[PDB]
Paper text:
BCKA flux through the complex is inhibited by E1α phosphorylation (Ser337 in the full-length human protein) by branched-chain ketoacid dehydrogenase kinase ([name] or [name]).
S3, which was one of the initial hits found from our targeted file screening efforts detailed above, was intriguing because this weak inhibitor bound in a distinct mode adjacent to the allosteric binding site. The phenyl ring tethered to the carboxylic acid in S3 extends towards the kinase domain, forming interactions with Y241 and Y346, which are not observed in the BT2/[name] structure. The R171 side chain Pi-stacks with the phenyl ring containing the carboxylic acid, and the N atom of the central thiazole ring is also involved in a water-mediated hydrogen bond network. The terminal methyl group of S3 positioned at the cusp of the lipophilic pocket filled by the halo-dithiophene motif of PF-07208254 presented an opportunity to improve potency by filling this pocket with lipophilic groups.
Residue numbers in the entry:
A (entry chain A), B (entry chain A): 26 to 50, 54 to 306, 332 to 375
Write the structure that this text describes.
């Protein structure tokens, strides 16, 4: 479509987490919605550009074509909406944003299926990794903007949209610990206990949304490895130790397990999409998605394998405030 | 000299640690000495080539020139010796090797002084790091060959020259722990206790010589950081935890301290020669020498800083046997 061509070239306008805390007023609701209305089609068109740039044989896969078609229909639905002038115009847009978040819920699952089906034709090894990294980060960016504006309507305590003003890293870790242990216990009959140390009382403004994905994935990985390495003593398994290091530059969460580590042969494949050695696991998405997430947010995800003993996983996320 | 020109081009012949275990027979003494006699001048000439390749203004420094002159006189002394035919010819060579090890004892200290004096003229940032990395590794290579042949005369238990047949990583760590604590206690009035865990009963053939330098340097660093971060409670300081991970590919020694970590601003300078934030410390050689050492021996030295909490230092060394 010619309308998509125009918005693909248009540069992306990023709203810094520090700037995002401008929710005062309800004139602040209109100001935010007017931004969301202009910024959402640009992000969609940038991704349509990525589908258009895929090699022909891959872009032709019926599942890839379907996802491409979903992105085009999404851009159509969003741009057709008239500009926001009053609180009635702001209200109807929120319903399009909520529909966008539901119509595109399974885009990554269809994209992985389509890309996997096209294995025979994929020559560039990096092609799939870069396409999924770019898709996953754009979606996080869109979901961040969309959830933030939708959350501005609610009067959620300790939050300004999706920014928590008083986030405790200990609390968010604790939240996922019991959730991962319940999944682990289901498959292995037991789960390792988790110990949290370091800056346990650190409290700071932060966006928990990315941590809500990364932490359960990293805890599921650490727990599965601990269980698969202690199969002969499933009830006597070593604890997973999480350390919080909060400094003025970044937040570091180190997840140290005694699960035998990542084998030297698998060490270069663990960060590849679909690579697994196994619903908890048997997907191969946990690590590459978590790294793409951490890096998109000015951080990093680093692995330190001690083969025969365990692994230390270092999640770093840059603090809010420049 | 024209004789040096000839041996600079001659490729280096490396004796694999696995091959080195050929001490049988005393015809094995002659076979080894005949190799040492031919290989030692090649290693010296390769380094003379490095001095000849330094930029003129740097090579002209009187201290640099003196070290260059030491390498030339060393090559002269070694090549002038007649080939080894009998046990009297083998015996006299061992005295030249022992003299070589003493005449060149302070080469690195003079080289660092000369290179530091030439700071104003050094344009390439990597120049000093690569020169010292190459000097330190060549010396380790020469010292390995020289000490191995000299040790073949002794009947040291559990050793074949410099290869320990039954090395315990726990024991060698323990050996340096009390030594580093005594140095640390002298400056800070106390020292952190050290805890060793993991493959504590692992025993394997290995060359301890590089570990005899790396371990005390890494323990001195971890202990100094722990003391400087707990200055208000110098008698209540956290333990330094060393983990041994012995697998079929490599030996991993992780030294984890709660010494506040390496600051983000210093993180890229810590591996540079002379960089320090301070006879234990105030040298800036510990980290870059240890990494050059680990890498020369098919391993690595990796740092993981948790700013505000501590640092994890990962020493990896490839096992003996291909
Ligand atoms: N803590 C860990 N210890 C050992 N291996 C791990 C650990 N975390 C991840 N891995 C390895 O990395 C592979 C890929 O991980 P991930 O991307 O999370 O996928 P999945 O959990 O679906 O298998 C896993 O199958 C596993 O072999
Ligand atoms: N465990 C550690 N924790 C914190 N900082 C460290 C640690 N190890 C090294 N460093 C930093 O790296 C610098 C350089 O280390 P090194 O090369 O060992 O030199 P030196 O010990 O002579 O200062 C140190 O001055 C220190 O600031
Ligand atoms: C336009 C749009 C619609 C839905 C989304 C969603 N993203 C998620 C998600 C959450 C965690 C890890 C990955 C993902 C992922 O599918 O991208 C769920 S719905 C993002 C953008
Ligand atoms: C020909 C020759 C002579 C002496 C040597 C020595 N090397 C050391 C040493 C030990 C540990 C860390 C560094 C060094 C270092 O000075 O290279 C001491 S004497 C190496 C080669
Ligand atoms: K993976
Ligand atoms: K240093
Ligand atoms: Mg996973
Ligand atoms: Mg040191």
């Amino acid at each position: 479509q010619s309308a998509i061509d125009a918005a693909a070239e248009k540069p992306s306008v990023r709203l810094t987490p520090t700037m995002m805390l401008y929710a005062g007023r309800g004139s602040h609701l209109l100001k935010s919605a007017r931004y969301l209305q202009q910024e959402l089609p640009v992000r969609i068109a940038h991704r349509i550009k990525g589908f258009r740039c895929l090699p022909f044989i891959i872009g032709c896969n019926p599942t890839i074509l379907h996802v491409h078609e979903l992105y085009i229909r999404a851009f159509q639905k969003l741009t057709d909406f008239p500009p926001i002038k009053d609180q009635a115009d702001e209200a109807q847009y929120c319903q399009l944003v909520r529909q966008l978040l539901d119509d595109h819920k399974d885009v990554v699952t269809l994209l992985a299926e389509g890309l996997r089906e096209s294995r025979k034709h994929i020559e560039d090894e990096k092609l799939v990794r870069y396409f999924l990294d770019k898709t996953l980060t754009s979606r996080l960016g869109i979901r961040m903007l969309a959830t933030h504006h939708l959350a501005l309507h609610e009067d959620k305590p300790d939050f300004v949209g999706i920014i928590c003003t008083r986030l405790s890293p200990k609390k968010i870790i604790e939240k996922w610990v019991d959730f991962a242990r319940r999944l682990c216990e289901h498959k292995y009959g037991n789960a390792p206990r988790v110990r949290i140390n370091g800056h346990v009382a650190a409290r700071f403004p932060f966006i928990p949304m990315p941590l809500d994905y990364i932490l359960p994935e990293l805890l599921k990985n650490a727990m599965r490895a601990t269980m698969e390495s202690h199969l002969d003593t499933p009830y006597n398994v070593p604890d997973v130790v999480i350390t919080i290091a909060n400094n003025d530059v970044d937040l570091i969460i180190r997840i140290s397990d005694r699960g035998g580590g990542i084998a030297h042969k698998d060490l270069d494949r663990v960060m590849d999409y679909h690579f697994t050695t196994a619903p908890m696991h048997g997907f191969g998405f946990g690590l590459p998605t978590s790294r793409a997430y951490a890096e998109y947010l000015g951080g990093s995800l680093q692995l330190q394998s001690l083969q025969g003993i365990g692994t230390d996983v270092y999640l770093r996320l840059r603090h809010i405030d420049g």
